[PDB]
RNA sequence: UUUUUUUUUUU
RNA sequence: UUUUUU
RNA sequence: UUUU
RNA sequence: GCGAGAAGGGAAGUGUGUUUCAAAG
RNA sequence: UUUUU
RNA sequence: UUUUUUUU
């Protein structure tokens, strides 16, 4: 009835989804795992070393570009590596006997099993910067919270139609730091709604 | 400059936050009503009049709420449309006046004693016809091939020079191309490689320029963003390196990456700046050969120029000991350092029996009202939800607060930060009103506890 | 044609495109065809044809610039690329590739 | 105002082609807005009564539900910021009576003026 | 910069004492005099800045008042024309029926 | 008494505007003009109901004062309040007369 | 500039270049050889040791 | 006064934070320094995209500071066009030019930006 | 321009003043700085809220949130404050630092004592310098070959 | 449930 | 106290 | 108190 | 000399209160 | 309460 | 490869 060969149509939205009797059918799905753990442990040591050696030449952003790592992911590698080494050199406790919540214990098992089947990743595979793309991220993505409407209705006419009312930013209160001392911390309360600045 | 008083620094943050929220207006054009309207005469007359009201609605900012009586407001709402520029949209004259005195109303200079002379980022015209109109080696960023389809800074340069300059360009590339083929054949990718340089004497392009280099640049659409950044760094480093043992030290690289190959003022900017510093110091060199001691950047675009300046600031940080910032919470800890001796017997209570740990008490609230009036209301003294502000950054050596720091952290409910019909708040003149005479007078009333919580 | 390709693959300034349809890209066409030399300038090519010499005027690129009957964007025997720069290689898409995987 | 509420009974018919309606000044203006949206095929003033045609598609009519909000005995008014809450996530048609003539609910929010909800077309709960 | 600067601290110490007064009183009175000068500075600054805002708001009121006056005048005139045109037709028509 | 959320609804705001006049002025028709320099003005007010969302009307008869005694029975006039008490019944002052009944 | 597109198999990911870092070239070489295997890679084994 | 947490089988899984962000303005915005900043899709995650980071970066840079009717229209248009054209001496595409006439068109190209920046020849 | 502050002044209560309040939950009381009259109760009517004060916080450092655009405005109106209030505002730079108890001239022994503490801190620095050259996580002693760990903070 | 942080949408 | 196990 |  | 009902439910229905404005002893 | 089997 | 699966 209509021609639209693209991948952002109503029917093409959320491809490979159960629409019918297949919703109740059990299906296995891949297990997610953070990128900072899938990398080769060997490379983590190397990356940490560089960071700790010369932060100027080896910045947080430049270091992650060569190995293809995000600015946030590379930060955790140094932080997690530091603590592991600190307890070994100082002869405090072994990493295996370290106390940690159950959420991390299950994560460690997955990391070991991930490599035992496929293997560790020699180089990360992720983009440093994001990209505006059409994807389904939760139920709050395909909804307009400003006008609170799902279906947009407009008049059909060839002539220029009047534009819609643009929204205004929401003014909220914030706090800033002016003077900081060991025995006292002074702060300032900002009120954007005040006409007189002074 | 160098605001030492606490009051001056406190007011600086207020202006920065207000500037971000301020947005210039954008009046949209309105179409003319149609004369051959098929509607009935009664509706046609009303529609024609309504069109004029909308035009003035978006071009007539409203005054303060306190100006007119309450009654007046109610009648206007039901008689005229709502203006698009409310009193609580833009800042008043007070904010503009303050910036004049504070000093917020040649851009950057990175100077290193011993290695590099200066690094000026002055932005102005190159071929308009000293800081930025005297050098001896001009740069160019042409397309991979020797023919510019459209756009590009080099398109203008080549045409300006006329056939005299063009003839020299085609001869130099021809010889270089042939040399690569023979060298790669006798000893044992038929095109050019990104990172090559070519020399071309000036032919009247600019009286104040001696040489004119030709450095090829790659594209941006190839690969992802992570791969694109890696490619640009390789070309920059190779270009700079070759230039060193070429001639006198005077670089006039206007702006690399701009044109038609894809550019990013945010990301690309940092690459360039960061690269310049290394060249000067010659980090990647076993045998130091100081030849190049002058690097400058020239940009025509005002917008771009401003952005470039920002990059400079970041570059200066973490490199020079005189501009090394440090958070206050960790700065004081680092000063009062001590050596603590811990024996084996002091860690007896540190160890625990259970291996794993988790929450042993669900956070499920039992009484919603009883708990709220016992542990929520007493601990809440503000009508707005404000999170903990970021820490203050201080210097390492001098131990004084710096000028540039992190911005504010505004909070929004449910993520949405857009209001279509903002109301007229009464917070514009706290404890102040208008008298019959027109003068400003105060009031004596208890403030509403939920004033800011009822937008 | 440009509008149709834009919807099929979003690509412009500051975005990673697949390079499909651009003049400087190799595609697996059913039959041989000449490159798209329409976007090249006419002033620089004409002045460069004489200085290039006979080596790069009749044996480098023109020796195979008219071997095929078909062409792209019409025909232009005067404007061409004397230099032998191969515009090979391509890029993978980010939408269709993620669906089959 | 009473004659305005008498149009829903005549226009809400399945097995019919054209229905009469009392002539009124306000009623004429209402039909103009509905025709723009494509709900009424056409109408004609036959003197003391107005003949209005009915639109059908695959048997069923285009109009399936009519709700009268305003009544002669009272008056419903909503502020510009309150109409959005009422009307949200719907395809319905609300007739708004503003000072500058009569317009739909979509245009009322654009101008930001306080209208008056008269009737509802193709509205659920 | 003087009152809030380091010079204020040393100024209090360099003060002449008086018989019958404690050492702390000499500094307290000196500090009180300084506190009187800061009040005037803030008062003058607030008034100067408030004047700029008051003038800006006055211009908006005048512009809005003029715009509203024209809109009402034009709208009222159009309505009167329709009534006058119709009233004339009835008067002449009524006399015709009487004959 | 009205709640905080009841002062922002269109129903209450519209009723308020009708009742509200410059200088707290009122509109009413005279019903008694027997005593010298005295006229009883009957004013009509309005109120809003937040339960059924309906507005009713209730008459408010008040006494007024006239200097020239121009007003007569059955003539709509305008009244203005005053910050005092004059006479046993007199509580208002005349400004003008809108409509005049023949004799 | 487009015409009838003929299906053709390409490997843009495994494409050595003159600007890639030495580590990237090494990493891609091993990965490429694993996918091209048709004896071990395209097989399913239940037990870990060759029992 | 609440601490949400899972109370079911799926007690340990990736729970990414989502921050819905609708369109900032429905009006058509131009390209900043040639880089398009128009909205492509409505689905936006918490992480700020590079395209949006450019617009917000430039926002903070902008400082707060700074007879018949038909006959009259044509009369003013001619006077304005002539006056503006004479200031340079004492838009649409497709403007061809010859190689030997480059100097003649070069001055015209650079002169239109002083009186009509909207021209994009 | 004294006419603009007439409403503020109250005949029954008194002139305006700046003080603190005591509110919250038992055991975790926090101070709240507000503006009120002289005879007004400690917890009651208030004109405007200037900020708050938390002398006890989890981090161990006393916090202080105040409005820089309101405190200066109120002082011009002629609002007094207690001795303790002046000291806190002095550190923030809003008002001149008031003298401490007994004045400044009497502070003779404290000056010498402060110098000794400062000298000790500088000398301690010199001690740790040598440590970094031969840092040893594990150091024994000639008593029983006992292990003694070393860690900085 | 963060070694050197009093910062952290930790999960 | 046993069984299993990169 | 597996920080009084 | 200055401060002190800081422990008050006894009066009132169209009142006590709320809201809109005004106040150079 | 007690505590490196 | 750690008193790992394994549980006052």
Q: Which residues are within 8 A (CB) of H1 and not within 5 positions of it... i.e. 6 or more apart? A: B365, B368, B371, B372, B375, B376
Residue E15: φ, ψ to 5°: -140, 150
Closest in A61, A163, A176 to B389, CB measured: A176
Nearest CA-CA partner of F12 in F51, F50, F69: F50
Answer yes or no: do C14 and H35 touch at CB < 8 A.
Answer: yes
Contact A65, A128 (CB under 8 A): yes
Q: What is the 3 state secondary structure string of chain I?
A: CHHHHCCCCECCCECCEEEEEEECCCCCCEEEEEEECCCCCCCCCCCEECEEEECCCCCCCCEEEECHHHHHHHHHCCCEECHHHHHHHHHCCCCCCCCCCCCCCCCCHHHHHHHHHHHHHHHHHHHHHHHHHCCCCEECCCCCCCCEEEEEC
CA Rg value for chain C: 17
Nearest CA-CA partner of I23 in B386, B379, B383: B379
Sheet holding D18-22, edge to edge: D18-22, D49-53, D43-45
* Cα–Cα separations (whole angstroms), residue I77 to A188, B157, F92, I74: 21, 67, 42, 5
Q: DSSP label at E2?
A: -
Question: By three-state DSSP, how is residue D83 classified?
Answer: helix
Residue A64: CB atoms within 10 A of its CB come to 23
Q: How far is A23 from chain B (nearest CA, A)?
A: 30
User: Would the Cβ of B354 be found within 7 angstroms of any atom in strand L?
Assistant: yes
Element (H, E) at B197: strand B197-198
Chain breaks in chain G (C to N over 2.5 A) after: none
**Mutual angle of helices B93-102 and B6-21, in 10-degree steps:** 130
Answer yes or no: do B14 and A165 touch at CB < 8 A.
Answer: no
Helices marked H in A90-175 — which ranges? 102-117
Nearest CA-CA partner of D92 in D63, D112, D55: D63
Q: Residue I103 corresponds to which tokens in the numbers above?
A: 């004045």
Distance A119 CA to O3 C1' (A): 29
Distance from C-alpha of B196 to C-alpha of B215, rounded to nearest angstrom: 6
Outline where DSSP puts E strands in H12-105: none
In terms of phi and psi (left: phi > 0; alpha: psi -120 to 50; beta: otherwise), the region of C10 is beta
Distance from C-alpha of C59 to C-alpha of C71, rounded to nearest angstrom: 20
Contact F68, F33 (CB under 8 A): no
Distance from C-alpha of D6 to C-alpha of D10, rounded to nearest angstrom: 7
Residue of A nearest to G41 (CA): A118
Contacts of G20 in chain B (CB under 8 A): 230
- The subunits that touch chain B, with at least 3 C-beta pairs less than 8 Å apart, are A, C, D, E, F, G, H, I
In terms of phi and psi (left: phi > 0; alpha: psi -120 to 50; beta: otherwise), the region of B399 is left
Nearest CA-CA partner of I48 in I39, I57, I37, I58: I37
Q: Tell whether the torsion through CA atoms of B251, B256, B260 and B261 is positive or negative.
A: positive
Answer yes or no: do A6 and C15 touch at CB < 8 A.
Answer: no
> Greatest CA span in chain H, whole angstroms?
85
A22 in contact with H at a CB cutoff of 8 Å? no
* Chain B 284..323 CB hits on strand M (< 7 A): none
H49 in contact with C at a CB cutoff of 8 Å? no
Closest in A91, A187, A198 to I64, CB measured: A187
Residue D80: CB atoms within 10 A of its CB come to 21
* Cα–Cα separations (whole angstroms), residue G9 to A139, E58, G16: 37, 73, 17
- The subunits that touch chain D, with at least 3 C-beta pairs less than 8 Å apart, are A, B, F
Nearest CA-CA partner of B197 in B217, B170, B215, B210: B215
Q: Which residues are within 8 A (CB) of B243 and not within 5 positions of it... i.e. 6 or more apart? A: B137, B197, B213, B251, B292
Residue of C43, C48, C94 to mutate for H, most H C-beta atoms under 10 A: C43
Angle made by CA atoms B108, B112, B114, in degrees to the nearest 5: 150
Q: Tell whether the torsion through CA atoms of I68, I73, I75 and I76 is positive or negative.
A: positive
Between positions 413 and 432 of B, the ones with CB within 8 A of A are 414-420, 422, 425, 427-430
Contact A179, B329 (CB under 8 A): no
Distance I62 CA to L3 C1' (A): 21
Distance from C-alpha of C87 to C-alpha of B91, rounded to nearest angstrom: 55
Q: Tell whether the torsion through CA atoms of I12, I16, I20 and I23 is positive or negative.
A: positive
Contacts of H53 in chain B (CB under 8 A): 266
Q: How far is A191 from chain I (nearest CA, A)?
A: 9
CA Rg value for chain I: 25
CB < 8 Å & 24+ apart, contacts of D22-29 = D22/D48, D22/D49, D22/D50, D23/D47, D23/D48, D23/D49, D23/D50, D25/B42, D26/D1, D27/D3, D28/B40, D28/B42, D29/B40, D29/B42, D29/B43, D29/D101, D29/D102
Answer yes or no: do H51 and A166 touch at CB < 8 A.
Answer: no
Q: Residue B293 corresponds to which tokens in the numbers above?
A: 């001691």
Contact B234, G19 (CB under 8 A): yes
Distance from C-alpha of B346 to C-alpha of E94, rounded to nearest angstrom: 117
Q: How far is B16 from chain G (nearest CA, A)?
A: 42
Element (H, E) at F46: strand F38-49
Which protein residues have a C-beta closer than 7 A to any atom of strand O?
A 94, 96-97; B 353-355
Distance from the Cα of residue B138 to its chain's centroid: 28
Which protein residues have a C-beta closer than 7 A to any atom of strand J?
A 79-80, 82-83, 85-86, 99-101, 103-104, 182, 185; B 327-330, 332-334, 357, 359, 387-388, 390-391; H 5, 14-15, 17, 19; I 58-61, 152-153
Distance from C-alpha of I37 to C-alpha of I16, rounded to nearest angstrom: 4
Closest nucleotide over all strands to B352 (CA to C1'):
L2
The string of DSSP codes covering B302-365 is HHHHHHHHHHHHHHHTTTSGGG-EEEHHHHHHHHS--EEEEEGGGGTTT--S-S----SS----
Angle made by CA atoms A74, A77, A78, in degrees to the nearest 5: 100
Question: By three-state DSSP, how is residue F76 classified?
Answer: strand
Residue B339: φ, ψ to 5°: -100, 105
Contact B420, D84 (CB under 8 A): yes
Which is it for strands D43-45 and D49-53: parallel, antiparallel or unpaired?
A: antiparallel
Q: Which residue has the tokens 């720091």?
A: B405
Q: Residue B306 corresponds to which tokens in the numbers above?
A: 């401003």
Contact D67, D123 (CB under 8 A): yes
Distance from C-alpha of A186 to C-alpha of B2, rounded to nearest angstrom: 20
Q: Which residue has the tokens 């991220």?
A: A137
Distance from C-alpha of D40 to C-alpha of G49, rounded to nearest angstrom: 78
Q: DSSP label at F79?
A: E
Q: Residue D24 corresponds to which tokens in the numbers above?
A: 């009124």
**Mutual angle of helices C42-52 and B163-186, in 10-degree steps:** 60
CB < 8 Å & 24+ apart, contacts of D22-26 = D22/D48, D22/D49, D22/D50, D23/D47, D23/D48, D23/D49, D23/D50, D25/B42, D26/D1
Outline where DSSP puts E strands in E5-93: none
Instruction: Tell me how the structure was determined.
Output: cryo-EM
Residue E15, beta-bridge partner list: none
Distance B355 CA to O8 C1' (A): 13
Closest in A146, A162, A197 to B94, CB measured: A197
Distance A28 CA to J2 C1' (A): 34
Distance B66 CA to M23 C1' (A): 19
Contact B328, B391 (CB under 8 A): yes
* Cα–Cα separations (whole angstroms), residue I97 to I78, I87, I91: 19, 7, 7
Nearest CA-CA partner of A127 in C15, I34, I117: C15
Residue A186, beta-bridge partner list: A179, I64
Contact I23, I32 (CB under 8 A): yes
Closest nucleotide over all strands to B334 (CA to C1'):
J4
Q: Which residue has the tokens 């902008």?
A: H62
Residue of A nearest to D112 (CA): A165
Distance B443 CA to M20 C1' (A): 15
């Amino acid at each position: 009835q209509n021609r639209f060969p693209v991948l952002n149509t109503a029917e093409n939205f959320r491809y490979w989804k159960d629409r019918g009797l297949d919703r109740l059918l059990p299906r296995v799905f891949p297990l997610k795992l953070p990128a900072h753990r899938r990398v080769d442990p060997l490379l983590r040591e190397y990356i940490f070393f560089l960071h700790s050696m010369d932060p100027a030449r080896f910045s947080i952003r430049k270091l992650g570009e060569r190995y293809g790592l995000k600015e946030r992911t590379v930060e955790l590698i140094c932080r997690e590596f530091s603590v592991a080494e600190f307890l070994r050199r100082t002869e405090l406790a072994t990493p295996y006997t370290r106390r940690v919540s159950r959420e991390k214990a299950v994560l460690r098992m997955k990391e070991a099993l991930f490599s035992l089947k496929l293997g560790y990743d020699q180089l990360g595979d992720e983009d440093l910067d994001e990209q505006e793309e059409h994807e389904f991220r939760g139920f709050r993505s395909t909804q307009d919270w400003i006008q609170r409407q799902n279906i947009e209705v407009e008049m059909m006419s060839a002539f220029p139609l009047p534009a819609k009312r643009n929204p205004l930013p929401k003014r909220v209160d914030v706090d800033v730091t002016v003077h900081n001392t060991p025995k006292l911390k002074v702060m300032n309360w900002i009120d954007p709604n005040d006409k007189v600045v002074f | 400059r160098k605001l030492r008083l606490h009051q001056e620094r406190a007011s600086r943050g207020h202006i920065e936050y207000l500037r971000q929220l301020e947005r210039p207006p954008t009046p949209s054009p309105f179409p003319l009503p149609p004369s051959p309207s098929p509607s009935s005469p009664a509706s046609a007359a009303a529609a024609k009049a309504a069109a004029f009201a909308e035009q003035a609605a978006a071009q007539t900012p409203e005054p303060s709420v306190l100006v007119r009586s309450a009654e007046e407001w109610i009648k206007r709402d039901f008689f005229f449309p709502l203006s698009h520029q409310p009193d609580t949209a833009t800042a008043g004259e007070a904010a503009r006046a303050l910036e004049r005195e504070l000093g917020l109303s040649l851009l950057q200079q990175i100077e290193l004693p011993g290695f590099g002379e200066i690094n000026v980022v002055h932005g102005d015209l190159l071929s308009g016809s000293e800081g930025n109109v005297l050098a001896a080696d001009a740069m160019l960023v042409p397309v991979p091939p020797n023919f510019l389809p459209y756009r590009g800074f080099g398109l203008e340069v080549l045409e300006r020079g006329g056939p005299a300059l063009q003839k020299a360009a085609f001869v130099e590339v021809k010889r270089k191309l042939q040399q690569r083929e023979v060298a790669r054949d006798l000893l044992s990718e038929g095109g050019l490689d990104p990172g090559d340089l070519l020399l071309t004497p000036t032919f009247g392009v600019c009286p104040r320029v001696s040489l004119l280099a030709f450095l090829v640049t790659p594209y941006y659409w190839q690969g992802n963003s992570t791969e694109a950044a890696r490619r640009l760094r390789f070309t920059m480093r190779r270009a700079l390196d070759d230039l060193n043992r070429q001639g006198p030290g005077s670089l006039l690289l206007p702006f690399v990456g701009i044109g038609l190959y894809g550019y990013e003022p945010r990301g690309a900017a940092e690459i360039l700046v960061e690269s310049a510093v290394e060249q000067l110091l010659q980090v990647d060199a076993v045998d130091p050969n100081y030849t190049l001691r002058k690097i400058t950047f020239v940009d025509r675009d005002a917008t771009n120029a401003a952005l470039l300046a920002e990059a400079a600031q970041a570059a200066k940080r973490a490199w020079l000991p005189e501009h090394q910032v440090v958070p206050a919470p960790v700065y004081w800890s680092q000063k009062q350092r001590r050596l603590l001796d811990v024996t084996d017997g002091m860690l007896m209570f540190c160890r625990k029996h259970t291996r794993l740990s988790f929450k042993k008490h669900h956070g499920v609230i039992r009484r919603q009202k009883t708990h709220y009036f016992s542990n929520v209301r007493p601990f809440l003294w503000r009508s707005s939800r404000v999170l903990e502000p970021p820490p203050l950054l201080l210097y390492r050596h001098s131990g004084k607060p710096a000028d540039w720091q992190l911005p504010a952290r505004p909070f929004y409910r449910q993520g949405v930060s857009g209001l279509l019909f903002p109301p007229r708040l009464r917070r514009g003149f706290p404890s102040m009103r208008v008298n019959s005479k027109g003068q400003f007078v105060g009031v004596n009333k208890m403030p509403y506890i939920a004033e800011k919580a009822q937008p | 044609t440009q509008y149709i390709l834009n919807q099929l693959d979003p690509g412009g300034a500051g975005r990673n495109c697949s390079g499909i349809g651009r003049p400087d890209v190799r595609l697996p066409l059913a039959k041989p065809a000449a490159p798209s030399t329409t976007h090249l300038p006419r002033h620089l090519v004409q002045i460069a044809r004489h200085v290039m010499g006979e080596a790069g005027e009749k044996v480098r690129r023109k020796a195979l610039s008219f071997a095929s009957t078909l062409s792209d964007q019409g025909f232009s025997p005067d404007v061409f690329d004397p230099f032998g720069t191969p515009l090979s290689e391509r890029s993978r898409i980010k939408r269709l590739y993620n669906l089959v995987c | 105002m009473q004659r305005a509420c008498e149009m829903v009974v005549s226009l809400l018919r399945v097995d019919a082609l054209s229905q009469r309606c009392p002539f009124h000044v306000l009623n004429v203006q209402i039909l103009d807005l509905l025709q723009r949206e494509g709900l009424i095929r056409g109408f004609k003033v036959d003197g003391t009564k107005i003949d209005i045609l009915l639109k059908h598609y695959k048997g069923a009519p285009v109009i399936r539900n009519i709700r009268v909000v305003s009544k002669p005995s009272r008056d419903i008014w909503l502020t510009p910021h309150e109409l959005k809450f009422r009307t949200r996530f719907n395809t319905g048609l609300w007739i708004m009576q503003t000072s500058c003539g009569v317009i739909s609910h979509r245009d009322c929010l654009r101008m930001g003026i306080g209208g008056k909800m008269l009737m509802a077309i193709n509205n659920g709960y | 910069h003087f009152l809030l600067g380091p010079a204020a601290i040393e100024q209090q110490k360099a003060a002449k004492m008086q018989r019958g007064l404690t050492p702390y009183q000499t500094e307290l009175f000196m500090w009180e005099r300084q506190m009187r000068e800061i009040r005037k500075i803030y008062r003058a600054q607030y008034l100067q800045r408030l004047a700029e805002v008051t003038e800006e708001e006055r211009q908006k009121q005048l512009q809005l008042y003029l715009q509203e006056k024209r809109e009402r005048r034009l709208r009222r005139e159009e309505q009167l024309q329709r009534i006058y045109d119709d009233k004339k037709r009835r008067a002449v028509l009524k006399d015709r029926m009487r004959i | 008494h009205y709640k905080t959320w009841q002062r922002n609804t269109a129903g209450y705001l519209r009723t308020f505007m009708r009742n509200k006049l410059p200088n707290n002025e009122m509109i009413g028709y005279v019903i008694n003009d027997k005593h010298p320099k005295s006229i009883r003005v009957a004013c009509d007010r309005f109120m809003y109901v937040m339960r059924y969302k309906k507005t009713f009307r209730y008459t408010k008869k008040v006494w007024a004062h006239d200097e020239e005694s121009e007003a007569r029975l059955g003539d709509v006039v305008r009244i203005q309040p005053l910050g005092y008490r004059i006479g046993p019944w007199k509580n208002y002052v005349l400004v003008r007369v809108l409509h005049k009944e023949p004799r | 500039a487009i015409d009838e597109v003929i299906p053709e198999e390409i490997r843009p990911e495994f494409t050595p270049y003159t600007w890639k870092s030495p580590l990237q070239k090494w990493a891609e070489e091993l990965k490429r050889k694993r996918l091209t295997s048709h004896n071990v890679y395209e097989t399913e084994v239940f037990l870990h040791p060759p029992a | 006064a609440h601490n949400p947490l899972p109370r079911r089988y799926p007690l340990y899984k990736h729970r990414t934070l989502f921050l819905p962000l609708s369109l900032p303005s429905y009006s058509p915005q131009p390209a900043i320094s040639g880089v398009a900043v128009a909205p492509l899709t409505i689905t936006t995650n918490a992480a700020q995209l590079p395209r949006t980071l450019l617009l917000q970066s430039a926002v903070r840079q902008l400082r707060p500071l700074s007879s018949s009717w038909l006959a009259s229209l044509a009369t003013s248009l001619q006077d304005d066009a002539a006056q503006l054209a004479g200031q340079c001496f004492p838009g649409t595409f497709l403007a061809v030019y010859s190689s030997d006439e480059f100097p003649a068109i070069c001055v015209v190209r650079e002169a239109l930006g002083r009186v009509a920046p909207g021209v994009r020849l | 321009v004294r006419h603009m502050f007439l409403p503020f002044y109250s005949k029954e209560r008194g002139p305006p003043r700046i003080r603190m309040q005591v509110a919250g939950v038992k055991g975790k009381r926090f101070y709240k700085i507000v503006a009120a009259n002289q005879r007004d109760p400690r917890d009651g009517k208030h004109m405007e809220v200037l900020g708050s004060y938390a002398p006890c916080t989890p981090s161990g450092v006393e916090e202080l949130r105040l409005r820089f655009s309101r405190i200066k405005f109120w002082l011009a109106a002629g609002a007094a404050f207690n001795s303790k209030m002046g000291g806190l505002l002095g550190n923030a730079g809003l008002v001149p630092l008031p003298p401490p108890m007994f004045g400044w001239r009497t502070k003779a022994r404290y000056t010498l004592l402060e110098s000794v503490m400062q000298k000790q801190e500088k000398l301690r620095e010199n001690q740790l310098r040598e440590y970094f050259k031969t840092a040893e996580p594990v150091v024994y002693r000639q008593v029983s070959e006992d292990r003694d760990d070393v860690e900085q903070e």
